[PDB]
């Protein structure tokens, strides 16, 4: 399943990586790419943003509609084992690079001394261009269930194995 243009339009440069608009008001990213010592995100003051973060997953809920062009989509805490997700990687040039990954177990993992609630996966070589393999932290892990796309994690770590941070 190819991610449609509106789905890619949710992937947004943020901090030292990327994040993803789940809805007009909800933005998700990986905690370690979030800038510190700032007074605003996307021009909105801290006092107008509800933060929900843990385990390398960060969610922002803005008090104002920031992306009213978007429908609200489902964010899930990971996905069933064996799901094939696409990691929606974008280059600075705007080139789109969906990377297929076979997902494994949701688990608690220590990664470089930080507690990560995440899901491991293995890149699906057979579903990516030859040689297309491992600043992309925060890219969303998505999959299509029935008629709807679901987001289930944000890119956090890699070595042919990857980990997305997850949160409900």
Tokens representing residue 96 in the block = 């789109």
- Read off the DSSP letter of residue 125: G
Return the H-helix or E-strand segment holding 6: helix 5-8
Resolution in A: 1.0
The coordinates were experimentally obtained by X-ray
Residue 105: CB atoms within 10 Å: 11
Decide the pairing of beta strands 74-75 and 148-158. parallel
Sketch out the chain's domains with CATH numbers.
1-72 (2.40.10.10), 73-168 (2.40.10.10)
Instruction: Measure the CA dihedral 143/144/150/152, to 10°.
Output: -20
Q: Which residues pair with 101 in a beta bridge?
A: 85, 123
Nearest of 97, 112, 89, 106 to residue 152 by alpha carbon: 106
SS3 55: coil
Nearest to 90 by CA among 21, 30, 9: 9
DSSP 8-state class, residue 76: -
Identify the DSSP state of 61. E
Which residues lie below 8 Å from residue 146, measured CB to CB, with a gap of 6+? none
Q: Which residues are catalytic?
A: 32, 56, 137
Residues 6+ away with beta carbon under 8 Å from 2: 98
């Amino acid at each position: 399943h190819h991610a449609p243009p509106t789905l890619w339009s949710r992937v947004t440069k943020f901090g030292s990586g990327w994040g993803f608009w789940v809805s007009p008001t909800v933005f998700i990213t990986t905690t370690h790419v979030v800038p510190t010592g700032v007074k605003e995100f996307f021009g909105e003051p801290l006092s107008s943003i509800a933060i929900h973060q843990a385990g390398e997953f960060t969610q922002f809920r803005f008090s104002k509609k920031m992306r009213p062009d978007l429908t609200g989509m489902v964010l899930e805490e990971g996905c069933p084992e064996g799901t094939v997700c696409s990691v929606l990687i974008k280059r600075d040039s705007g080139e789109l690079l969906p990377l297929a990954v076979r997902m494994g177990a949701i688990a608690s993992m220590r990664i470089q001394g930080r507690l990560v609630h995440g899901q491991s996966g293995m890149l699906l070589t057979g579903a990516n261009a030859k040689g297309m393999d491992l600043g992309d932290c925060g890219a969303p892990y998505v999959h299509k269930r029935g008629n709807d796309w679901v987001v289930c994690g944000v890119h956090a770590a890699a070595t042919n194995t990857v980990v997305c941070a997850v949160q409900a």
